[model samples]
Target chain A: FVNQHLCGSDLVEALYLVCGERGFFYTKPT
Target chain B: GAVEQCCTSICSLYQLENYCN
Candidate 1:
């Protein structure tokens, strides 16, 4: 498990790192 | 559990971005 808060430019990288090949589509807004 | 956490974090980020813009 990872604990971090990312913003702005870092958001894209965070998605890539957090979701991998599945990308942004892997997670939907709540 | 880790996967769910990732999803929650991602969702939060997504909402934050939308809220900011």
Candidate 2:
């Protein structure tokens, strides 16, 4: 829960938000 | 292929949190 919120977080949007920032670089871009 | 590697990196990144204190 906290981890998911560790992004530029919105409880409803964090999962999508992460894929754009914070989590994007950690992902090897396709 | 390309997609697999990307997901794996995300997995590797996030998976580390399982050990968090």
Candidate 3:
């Protein structure tokens, strides 16, 4: 992944679950 | 695999470069 930073604990948790759908990890926001 | 974009690694740089600047 290119991006390696995150803010907002609650939002981060929600966002991570989305990536699990694709068996992938997020690298950026927007 | 469903989608791997694999053909050959004889030229990987040319392929990966398409992802960025």
Candidate 4:
């Protein structure tokens, strides 16, 4: 999940949601 | 997913460099 440190909260939230949609890295914000 | 990742990464950098900077 790219360590979640090299990324921003908003971007992480956005990506996290997509990962959920595509059945990938789904969870909570950040 | 690669394209989305790239584009959003750019967006995040922009936000940090511009708005969040």
Candidate 5:
């Protein structure tokens, strides 16, 4: 499970990495 | 847009994908 304490771009990047590791690809909105 | 909102959206989408699998 992801940590809810993560915030800002840090959270976005962390979640993105988690998804990637889980075999999913996510493109963050610009 | 707030980060919480963006994070929530991403989390929801991720879960949706998980559920779809």
Candidate 6:
């Protein structure tokens, strides 16, 4: 769920949409 | 799904109306 799959985020806003994105989300919200 | 941390319901589970997994 990323643009490059390896880069799944709006780096400016620190948002990502990867399967692992959820991983990093609750794992670390900021 | 699987995880090593929080969930939508779990955050409420600390007497907070949530789940832990």
| Descending-TM-score candidate ranking | 1, 5, 4, 3, 2, 6
- DockQ for every prediction shown: 0.08, 0.07, 0.02, 0.05, 0.20, 0.03
Which portions of model 4 miss their true places by more than 4 Å? Answer: A1-7, A21-30, B1-21
Model 2 error, position A4 (Å): 7.7
Which lDDT tens digits does candidate 3 get at residues A1-30?
A: 222232333223433443334233324578
Please give, for residues A1-30, the per-residue lDDT of candidate 5 as tens digits: 544443456554665555555543333467
Please write out the lDDT profile of model 4 over residues B1-21, one tens digit for every residue. 122344333444333222210
Question: Which residue runs does candidate 2 get wrong by more than 4 Å?
Answer: A1-12, A21-30, B1-21
lDDT of 1 by residue, A1-30 (tens): 443655434555665654555535333567
Model 1 chain A, poorest ten-residue lDDT window? Answer: A18-27
User: All candidates' lDDT scores?
Assistant: 0.45, 0.30, 0.31, 0.37, 0.45, 0.24
Q: What TM-score do all the candidates reach, one by one?
A: 0.34, 0.18, 0.24, 0.26, 0.30, 0.14
Each model's iRMS: 10.7, 10.3, 13.3, 10.7, 6.7, 12.7
- Give me the overall lDDT of model 6: 0.24
Worst 10 residues of 2 chain A by lDDT: A3-12
Worst 10 residues of 5 chain A by lDDT: A19-28
The per-residue C-alpha lDDT of model 4 at residue B1 equals 17
Candidate 4: tens digits of C-alpha lDDT, residues A1-30: 332323434545555453444333324475
- Residue B18 lDDT (model 1): 36
Q: Give the runs in model 6 whose Cα sits over 4 Å from its true position.
A: A1-16, A25-30, B1-21
- Runs of candidate 1 exceeding 4 Å displacement: A1-5, A25-30, B1-21
lDDT of 1 by residue, B1-21 (tens): 023443334446454333321
Residue A28 error, candidate 6, Å: 5.9
Model 3 stretches astray by more than 4 angstroms: A1-7, A21-30, B1-21
